[PDB]
């Protein structure tokens, strides 16, 4: 897993139907780091340090073994920084 802070939300209307009705959140390892996007399996508010799982694990953390997700927020860190 990686510790990434939520920066904002992302919205793709043309997203594949396999993504389902699942929120997507821009994330980064620090402010200024490359911005990734993760399926928000938990409900995370912007500014939340979060735990993000990579491929295979992220597909079942996002709801199905066949889910199109290589990144998913599996939790919010009780306290970081």
């Amino acid at each position: 897993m990686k510790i990434m802070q939520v920066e904002k939300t992302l919205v793709s209307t043309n997203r594949i139907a396999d993504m389902g009705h699942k929120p997507l959140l821009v994330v980064w390892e620090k402010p200024g780091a490359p911005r990734q996007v993760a399926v928000d399996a938990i409900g995370c508010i912007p500014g939340d340090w979060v735990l993000c799982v990579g491929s295979s694990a992220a597909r079942e953390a996002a709801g199905s073994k066949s889910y199109p997700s290589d990144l998913t927020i599996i939790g919010i860190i009780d306290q970081w920084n």
């Binding site: 938990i42 409900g43 995370c44 508010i45 939340d48 919010i76 009780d78």
Partner: protein, 92 residues
């Protein structure tokens, strides 16, 4: 903390049992009691995530066989700045 525990019940007796249990079982603050209509009463508590998880668990168990029972017991770790404005700040 900014976590939310909500325990909806059918009636206010299960809600008051749910809110006693939640408040005695963890360091959470009862922020509101809402009458929604149709005999649904939501007791909402606010505190750090672990406290809210312990509290919601105790409350659900407590209010389950009291009266018409538990409709829902739900934990929200972090609550959006927008959901804050639909949430009672202090109990009434």
């Amino acid at each position: 903390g900014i976590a939310l525990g909500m325990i909806e019940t059918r009636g206010l007796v299960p809600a008051i049992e749910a809110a006693d249990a939640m408040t005695k079982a963890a360091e959470v603050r009862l922020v509101g009691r809402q009458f929604v209509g149709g005999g649904y009463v939501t007791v909402l508590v606010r505190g750090e995530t672990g406290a809210v998880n312990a509290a919601v668990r105790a409350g659900a168990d407590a209010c389950e066989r009291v009266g018409d029972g538990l409709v829902a017991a739900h934990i929200i770790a972090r609550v959006h700045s927008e959901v804050e404005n639909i949430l009672p700040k202090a109990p009434q």
